[PDB]
């Protein structure tokens, strides 16, 4: 996260760490949607261009973390993935369209002060909060500079108009994405960065006070550059894919 802050203890109880067994290392961010399911960017799994193609056995999921690096002894819980599900129409070939994936943990995780799921948005929550101008919050243990933080970082970013979004890049922007960041005039910064991927873009609902997961950190050009924005998977646009797998693979 670029130009963010040290998260407070239990500020983001849904943040997960996608951690590689060997070498032991932080792959990406993710989020707990229930005691058995994790949500991430498919590109954290699969990415042929870089010879990336992790299996269930190549990873570890770590929930309850604050500290980037230390093993937080009675606070964190490590899990073994049971299954991996990548959107069947994820586009690694052109724009990272549909960069979503689900993870079935091998045994449910017990909730605690530091571990608690985030709510998936319904058609109306989506419709009333997803408005340019509205701020959302991103989290992660990714680079601080377009370096590796000590503690979980947080940043609040305003949502940007589709058009401003399209004109800041040459990449083809689909309806499954949304961009965020401040405008250069706004003179306020912050962004996600390498290693931030898969983390949640969340919003607090003013109707019922619940945290909602609207986006998934997906991609961007550089990190915190004027005239450039962060791009996120639109969690609501793909809710039917999500609904559809939780009840076949059955969460």
């Amino acid at each position: 996260i670029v130009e963010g802050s040290d998260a407070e203890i239990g500020m983001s109880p849904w943040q997960v760490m996608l951690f590689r067994k060997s070498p032991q290392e932080l792959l990406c961010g993710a989020s707990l949607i229930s005691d058995r399911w994790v949500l991430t960017a498919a590109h954290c799994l699969l990415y042929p261009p870089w010879d990336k193609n992790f299996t269930e056995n190549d990873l570890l999921v770590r929930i309850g973390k604050h500290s980037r690096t230390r093993y937080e002894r009675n606070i964190e819980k490590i899990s073994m993935l049971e299954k991996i599900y990548i959107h069947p129409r994820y586009n690694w070939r052109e724009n990272l369209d549909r960069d979503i994936a689900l993870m079935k943990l091998k045994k449910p995780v017990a909730f605690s002060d530091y571990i608690h799921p985030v709510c998936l948005p319904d058609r109306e929550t989506a419709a009333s909060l997803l408005q340019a101008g509205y701020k959302g919050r991103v989290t992660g243990w990714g680079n601080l500079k377009e370096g590796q933080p000590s503690v979980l970082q947080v940043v609040n970013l305003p949502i940007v108009e589709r058009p401003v979004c399209k004109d800041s890049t040459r990449i083809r922007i689909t309806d499954n994405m949304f961009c965020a960041g401040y405008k250069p005039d706004e003179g306020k910064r912050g962004d996600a960065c390498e290693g931030d991927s898969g983390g949640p873009f969340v919003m607090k609902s003013p109707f019922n006070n619940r945290w909602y997961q609207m986006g998934i950190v997906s991609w961007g050009e550089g990190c915190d550059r004027d005239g450039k924005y962060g791009f996120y998977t639109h969690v609501f646009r793909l809710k039917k894919w999500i609904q559809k797998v939780i009840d076949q693979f059955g969460e």
Partner: peptide
């Protein structure tokens, strides 16, 4: 700088 993890995890 990663601390190792209980082996019951690997």
């Amino acid at each position: 700088d990663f601390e190792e993890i209980p082996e019951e995890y690997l």
